[PDB]
Curated annotation (Swiss-Prot):
Target of drugs used in treatments against glaucoma disorder and breast cancer. The active site is at residue 61. The gene is CA2. It comes from Homo sapiens. Changing residue 15 to E: In Jogjakarta. Changing residue 91 to C/D/E/N/Q: Strongly reduced CO(2) hydrase and p-nitrophenyl acetate esterase activities, impaired stability of zinc binding. Optimum pH is 6-8. This is Carbonic anhydrase 2.
Length: 257
């Protein structure tokens, strides 16, 4: 099956998922000089006050912090979006070294990691139906650089020992994702895809310009996770990122000058 190893990594995905070579694949490099300010974009509305986190799961490719999305409790609206998108989960992509890990790049710069807050359009009723639509998902992408610790991340990294291996989950209630946001909500936006198989072309990407800082100790804990299941040979969960894909016939818009 697909993964991030030498024999099943991103360069292989197209054989099972031909859309890997499609017209609106993600991630992409964000060329900051070519992105155009779009004054008709609205401010982003991130309403996470009533967020209900439930569980954290190691799925063998990352870990997902999952939310109750059966009501409008944590939603993303505004910006490039029409309508209301419900938060279903967040997860990260990260490197084996601080010089790599992010999926999007900025003028070819790779960050140490990248956070994806995944939301689905409520007009499609459930996530499974949403991913079959060109405007089905909105993913808020946030870069991580290594420096000072992020207090709001610590509760996440401290539970990781309990979900070290594929298929393990743990209760993860009362987590506030507002603690993972940078100060500014300035962003770039473009139409793209899921960055893991099935690579569906259903995402409006909103990538924040301001990275968050996390500590070296925090990133070290990410790198202790395992891709493998319990009782299997240890393969560290690192470099679970897809590299930049061709922009093709797309324009990246900026919310700011
Ligand atoms: Zn992701």
């Amino acid at each position: 099956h697909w993964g991030y190893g030498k024999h099943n990594g991103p360069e292989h995905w197209h054989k099972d998922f031909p859309i890997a070579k499609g017209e609106r694949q993600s991630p992409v490099d964000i060329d900051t000089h070519t992105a155009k300010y779009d004054p008709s974009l609205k401010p982003l509305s991130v309403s996470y006050d009533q967020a209900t986190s439930l569980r954290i799961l190691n799925n063998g490719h990352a870990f997902n912090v999952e939310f109750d999305d059966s009501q409008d409790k944590a939603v993303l609206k505004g910006g490039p979006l029409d309508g209301t998108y419900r938060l279903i989960q967040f997860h990260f992509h990260w490197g084996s070294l601080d010089g790599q890990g992010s999926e999007h790049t900025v003028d070819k710069k790779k960050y140490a990691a990248e956070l994806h807050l995944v939301h689905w359009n409520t007009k499609y009723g459930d996530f499974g139906k949403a991913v079959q639509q060109p405007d089905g998902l909105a993913v808020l992408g946030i870069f991580l650089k290594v420096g000072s610790a992020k207090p709001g991340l610590q509760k996440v990294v401290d539970v990781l020992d309990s979900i070290k291996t594929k298929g393990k989950s743990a209760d993860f209630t009362n987590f506030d994702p507002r603690g993972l946001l940078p100060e500014s909500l300035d962003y770039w936006t473009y139409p793209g895809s899921l960055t893991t198989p099935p690579l569906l072309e259903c995402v409006t990407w909103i990538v924040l310009k301001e990275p968050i800082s996390v500590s070296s100790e925090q990133v070290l804990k990410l790198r202790k996770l395992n891709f493998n299941g319990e009782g299997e040979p240890e393969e560290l969960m690192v470099d679970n990122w897809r590299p930049a894909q061709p922009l093709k016939n797309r324009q990246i818009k900026a919310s700011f000058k």
